Amino acid sequence: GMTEYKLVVVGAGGVGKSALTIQLIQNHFVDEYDPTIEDSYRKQVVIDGETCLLDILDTAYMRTGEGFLCVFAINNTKSFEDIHHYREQIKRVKDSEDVPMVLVGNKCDLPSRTVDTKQAQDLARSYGIPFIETSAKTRQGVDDAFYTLVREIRKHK
């Protein structure tokens, strides 16, 4: 059969969890999206030549997660400061120190960057995970983030 990957998008309010998901799925940038709406979105894609099904859960099911995107916004220091909370949450619900994960720095199209690449890279390295810069507005890195996570899930086992 065709492979299915259950992915989960986590992070502080306003970082672009919904916008990133809707970019991946509907291929357009949502300028506003109810912050309390939590829902799952499905899409068939090809990644590195392999066809598969994605099941993205956009948080505002959690235990069934095979891979997690931890999102902060590069113009939102508070959202970056909060990442550890989500990291630790995931390790608790999965009851494991080994969970496929990607750190995502979103809104890289904006000029008022307060979290530099160095900081993000160092944080990611301390977790042993990749760091991907993204923009839900421009589509920069959007595929890369979600695909990298699938490659991490494939690399997981």
- Name beta bridge partners: 71: 11, 104
Q: Which is nearer to Mg ion, 12 or 124 (CB)?
A: 12
- CB of 18 vs Mg ion, minimal distance in Å: 3
- DSSP 3-state assignment of 123? helix
- CA dist 79 and 129 (Å) reads 18
Contact 5, 52 (CB under 8 A): yes
Determine if 48 is a binding residue for ligand GDP (CB under 6 A).
no
Considering only 12, 18, 65, 136, the residue that binds Mg ion (CB under 5 A) is: 18
Side chain identity at 6, as an amino acid letter? K
Residue in the structure block whose two tokens are 């530099």:
116
Lookup: tokens for 107: 């809104």
- DSSP 3-state assignment of 23? helix
Determine if 17 is a binding residue for ligand GDP (CB under 6 A).
yes
Site for ligand GDP in 116-135 (CB under 6 A): 135
Lookup: tokens for 89: 């949450």
Choices 18-26, 77-85, 110-118, 126-134 (CB under 5 A): range interacting with Mg ion: 18-26
- Name beta bridge partners: 47: 50
Which listed option, ligand GDP, Mg ion, none, makes contact with residue 15 (CB within 5 to 8 Å by class)? ligand GDP
Choices 16-24, 61-69, 90-98, 121-129 (CB under 5 A): range interacting with Mg ion: 16-24
Contact 150, 130 (CB under 8 A): no
Which listed option, ligand GDP, Mg ion, none, makes contact with residue 109 (CB within 5 to 8 Å by class)? ligand GDP
Determine if 32 is a binding residue for ligand GDP (CB under 6 A).
yes
Per CB under 5 A, residues contacting Mg ion are 17-18
Per CB under 6 A, residues contacting ligand GDP are 11, 13-19, 30-33, 35, 106-107, 109-110, 135-137
